[PDB]
């Protein structure tokens, strides 16, 4: 029966159950075949699929639909025996997240997902059919592949010629055959965002080849040392370069040749001296520059030459002092210096008229300069975990202040001038209740009413 009809998931029968089956076979093999299906495993899994389809009705899936951070409708499937056939009846679905779903075939019914843009294959090797493959080739924009094994990467993903954003999660390098599964990335002619979290010990050649049109390269070696070794100065169309946990311990000189770069992230690179930023004057559009989570001991005065900076991140470092040249960047809008050994703020901090977020959390700031309150559009502040002795009375000058963090300081009384901020609400006043009790009752009532409205 199973050699003809191809149902190999029927194990041989042991004692006292093969005897009765032999008797039945002598009477009529029809009963043998009517029993074999019910004893098979393929049939049980298919019946499980049908029960899944019946259980996850369209209303159930719609109630299960959520919206991710990007305000997109999301369906995250976890530990299901397969893709329910009714997940393709929701035309409003935008992102399909599949995690730990085995023996999964993408049906042609996925073509009904006109609004589908992102497909997350979490530890899921899925086969696809020609209609569904063509639909995804014409429609799918983003693909998230997380794999503990090379073979778990579907091999049809290189035929998606409208893909723009590919996220590779999982170790891919191997001995004597490295960077060959991703030889098909050249065929992704419309790829723009390439995220590589694979413990690369050297940037694969195909990445450099496909980077001529890449606009954002993101690498997360999770501790592995990454050697660029002159493989990065060809992606002149790049505008965002993220090197997270690459263990660089040094800024490579290949970055400064990317004349179109705007956002450079160097998180967890164990940076010590960042005096390489003198070469960043070549990048004539460098707006955001994240250097957080490093061992940076000092901010070089050459950071003043980067007059086009708007966002500067230097938190989680070993910075002890702030140079006065840092305040030559009058375009600066974010200056996050949280978790540092800073003890005071230079008076030039008020020169940055466009500063809007200033976090100095977890420092040794015992007092704030009065010049700090010249930044009238300072929407948010974070002065928590400091050693602030007293809050200056000029806090009310910042009319646009909305969210100010104050828990963890050595404060005794909150200023009455703190309540004159037109937009500050109890939600935006993060402070201990003992300190909050010091406000005048009019201020308390106004804050509570604002929080209500």
């Amino acid at each position, epitope marked *: 029966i199973r050699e003809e009809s191809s149902y190999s998931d029927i194990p041989d029968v042991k004692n006292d159950f093969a005897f009765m089956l032999h008797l039945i076979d002598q009477y009529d093999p029809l009963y043998s075949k009517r029993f074999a299906v019910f004893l098979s495993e393929v049939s049980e899994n298919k019946l499980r699929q049908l029960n899944l389809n019946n259980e996850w009705t369209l209303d159930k899936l719609r109630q299960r639909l959520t919206k991710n951070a990007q305000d997109k409708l999301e369906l995250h499937l976890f530990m299901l025996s397969g893709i329910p056939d009714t997940v393709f009846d929701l035309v409003e679905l935008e992102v399909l997240k599949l995690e730990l779903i085995p023996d999964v075939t993408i049906p042609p019914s996925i073509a009904q997902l006109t609004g589908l843009k992102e497909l997350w294959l979490y530890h899921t090797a899925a086969k696809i059919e020609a209609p569904a493959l063509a639909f995804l080739r014409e429609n799918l924009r983003a693909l998230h592949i997380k794999f503990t094994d090379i073979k778990e990467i579907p091999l049809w993903i290189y035929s998606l010629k409208t893909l723009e954003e590919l996220h590779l999660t999982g170790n891919l390098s191997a001995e004597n055959n490295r960077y060959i599964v991703i030889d098909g990335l050249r065929e992704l002619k419309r790829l723009k965002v390439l995220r590589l979290k694979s413990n690369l010990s050297k940037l694969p050649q195909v990445v450099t080849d496909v980077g001529v049109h890449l606009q954002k390269l993101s690498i997360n070696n999770e501790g592995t040392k990454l050697i660029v070794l002159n493989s990065l100065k060809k992606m002149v169309n790049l505008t965002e370069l993220e090197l997270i946990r690459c263990d660089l311990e040094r800024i490579p*000189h290949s970055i400064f040749s990317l004349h179109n770069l705007q956002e450079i992230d160097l998180k967890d690179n164990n940076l010590k001296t960042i*005096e*390489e930023i003198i*070469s960043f*004057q070549h990048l004539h559009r460098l707006t955001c520059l994240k250097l957080w989570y490093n061992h940076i001991a000092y901010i*070089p*005065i050459q950071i003043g030459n980067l007059t086009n900076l708007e966002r500067l991140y230097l938190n989680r470092n070993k910075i002890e002092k702030i*140079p006065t040249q840092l305040f030559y960047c009058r375009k600066l809008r974010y200056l996050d210096l949280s978790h540092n050994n800073l003890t005071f703020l230079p008076a030039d901090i008020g020169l940055l008229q466009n500063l809007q977020n200033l976090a100095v959390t977890a420092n040794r700031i015992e007092a704030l300069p009065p010049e700090l309150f010249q930044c009238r559009k300072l929407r948010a502040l974070h002065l928590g975990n400091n050693v602030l002795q007293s809050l200056p009375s000029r806090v009310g000058e910042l009319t646009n202040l909305t969210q100010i963090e104050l828990r963890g300081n050595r404060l005794e009384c909150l200023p009455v001038e703190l309540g004159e901020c037109p937009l500050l609400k109890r939600s935006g006043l993060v402070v201990e209740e003992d300190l909050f009790s010091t406000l005048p009752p009019e201020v308390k009532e106004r804050l509570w009413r604002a929080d209500k409205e």
Partner: nanobody, 114 residues
Framework: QVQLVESGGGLVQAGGSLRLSCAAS????????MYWYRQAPGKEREWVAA????????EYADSVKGRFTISRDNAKNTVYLQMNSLKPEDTAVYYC????????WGQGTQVTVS
């Protein structure tokens, strides 16, 4: 105990060549970035050039690109600033800056061009 002192400045015609010497005592010159700065009278100080701590990577300002040169010698522990194709605009006082533990500035050599 690092001393930064400049020499080789003066008054020279335009379109010529001039050379500056920055004397470093307390630190090896090849192991720290050396920055040349200029300050025009009645003007904020302007960066001139820099040398990397490795690979002989050099940086120059946009207005002075292709005209000035920077070099250093570890045997004698000095930084050379070679000024070429000079103009009355490049009349400023030149400083060689370093950061070895703290901020260090040179004495400053007066440079004037006709």
């Amino acid at each position: 105990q690092v001393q930064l002192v400049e020499s080789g400045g003066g008054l020279v015609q335009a379109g010529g060549s001039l050379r500056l010497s920055c004397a470093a005592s307390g630190f090896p010159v090849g192991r720290h970035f050396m920055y040349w700065y200029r300050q025009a009278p009645g003007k904020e100080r302007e960066w001139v050039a820099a040398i990397y701590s490795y690979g002989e990577y050099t940086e120059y300002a946009d207005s002075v690109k292709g005209r000035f040169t920077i070099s250093r010698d570890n045997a004698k522990n000095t930084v050379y600033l070679q000024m070429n194709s000079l103009k009355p605009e490049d009349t400023a006082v030149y400083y060689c800056y370093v950061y070895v533990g703290n901020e260090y500035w040179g004495q400053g050599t007066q440079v004037t061009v006709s």
